[PDB]
Amino acid sequence: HMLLTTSRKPSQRTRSFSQRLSRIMGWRYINRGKMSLRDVLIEARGPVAVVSERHGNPARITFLDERGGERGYILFNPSFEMKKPELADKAVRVSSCPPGSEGLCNLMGLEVDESSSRDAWSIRTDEEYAWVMELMDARGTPAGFKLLIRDFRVG
């Protein structure tokens, strides 16, 4: 459902993160090289997400519609282990979006699925972050991949 890319000249960590996330989501990943956003949108022919950084860390995901309108954005810090997540499917499901988190689900195109928590996201509150989005793997246990959400805005 989406093309993912990064801001221009990303660090190794931003690359690793974004390649990982796009695999998890089943989104098509492209190297940003030296393209403008306009040229990214031409290549995508469809919606795009851009992972941008501050100080060499991924810090924001911006979501665009196919014409380049900004759907919204998420400010976050990633938390991921070295081991590849074990997934049997695109992680396009979420177990629940509690009140106040619906925009996370809308931006990322997640569908609520109460039948199982495998290959799925869990959204919860945290003492430090606004939300933690944690990937549950093909066995429904923590995949070692989280989005630590500081804020998000839609529209």
From Swiss-Prot:
InterPro entries listed in its UniProt record: Brix, Brix_dom_Rbsml_bgen_prot
Annotated keywords: Ribosome biogenesis
GO molecular-function terms, A-Z: rRNA binding
GO biological-process terms attached to the record: rRNA processing
The organism's place on the tree of life at top rank: Archaea
SUPFAM superfamilies: Class II aaRS ABD-related (SSF52954)
Domain Brix: residue ranges: 2-155
Transmembrane segments: none
UniProt function note: Probably involved in the biogenesis of the ribosome.
Protein name: Probable Brix domain-containing ribosomal biogenesis protein
Protein's organism: Methanothermobacter thermautotrophicus (strain ATCC 29096 / DSM 1053 / JCM 10044 / NBRC 100330 / Delta H) (Methanobacterium thermoautotrophicum)
